[PDB]
Design a protein around this ligand. Structure first.
Ligand SMILES: OC[C@H]1O[C@@H](O[C@H]2[C@H](O)[C@@H](O)[C@H](O[C@@H]3[C@@H](O)[C@H](O[C@H]4[C@H](O)[C@@H](O)[C@H](O[C@H]5[C@H](O)[C@@H](O)[C@H](O[C@@H]6[C@@H](O)[C@H](O)O[C@H](CO)[C@H]6O)O[C@@H]5CO)O[C@@H]4CO)O[C@H](CO)[C@H]3O)O[C@@H]2CO)[C@H](O)[C@@H](O)[C@@H]1O
Ligand SMILES: [Ca+2]
Ligand SMILES: [Ca+2]
Length: 170
């Protein structure tokens, strides 16, 4: 493994995040005071049948040297479940691939959540047409990270310092 960390988004630079939604639901994103400097506020309104998400498509799919993904999250002031997602690259030249999820719940205080890659679970509610269907998370072949819906409720949260974590020392 690599030793240390590799920052994906501290939210001090290029706005890397797009939004998507369907069937009633909405999400919008903006820059605000984050955990250090600036972070990204996420506002959503869930629907029963609908969906919402914010997405970064990474310029590098090769994550196999690292052990965890980490980020700082906080709710803006009621508590509601969301999902953080890793998606592999498509096998058919279009769209994304196999979706890997971890549930989290922002609260009134800042929390650093560090998820081992081996604690992600394969998404059970949806897979895209482009998936490898391997049942494995292939860390040499990552397309995109997301924050996205878990339910039909509404909420607000702020994220900051999204990074990869390696080993402690050589
Ligand atoms: O056929 C009989 C009856 O059907 C009813 O309709 C059904 C239909 O059959 C079901 O298929 C449908 O199921 C939906 C399901 O489709 C929906 O899936 C979501 C999924 O949850 C989201 O995660 C996914 O989000 C993607 C975005 O769309 C996409 O824009 C975004 O793309 C990313 C880019 O923005 C980015 O720049 O780059 C990325 C990669 O480089 C890129 O991919 O990606 C995200 C993630 O992939 O969207 C899909 C929807 O498109 O999930 C919902 C929630 O459960 C299901 O409901 O259900 C309908 C019923 O509502 C007919 O209505 C009926 O008449 C027929 O009889
Ligand atoms: Ca920051
Ligand atoms: Ca796979």
């Amino acid at each position: 493994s690599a030793v240390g960390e590799k920052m994906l988004d501290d939210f001090e630079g290029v706005l890397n995040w797009g939004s998507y939604s369907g069937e009633g639901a909405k999400v919008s994103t903006k820059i605000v005071s984050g955990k250090t400097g600036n972070g990204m506020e996420v506002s959503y309104t869930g629907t029963t049948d609908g969906y919402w998400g914010t997405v970064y498509s990474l310029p590098d799919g090769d994550w196999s040297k690292w052990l965890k993904i980490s980020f700082d999250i906080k709710s803006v002031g009621s508590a509601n479940e969301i999902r953080f997602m890793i998606a592999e690259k498509s096998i058919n030249g279009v769209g994304d691939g196999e979706h890997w999820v971890y549930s989290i719940t922002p609260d009134s205080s800042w929390k650093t959540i560090e998820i081992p890659f081996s604690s992600f679970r394969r998404r059970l509610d949806y897979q895209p047409p482009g998936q490898d269907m391997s049942g494995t998370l292939d860390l040499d072949n990552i397309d995109s990270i997301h924050f996205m819906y878990a339910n039909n409720k509404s909420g607000k949260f702020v994220v900051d310092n999204i990074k990869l974590i390696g080993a402690l020392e050589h």
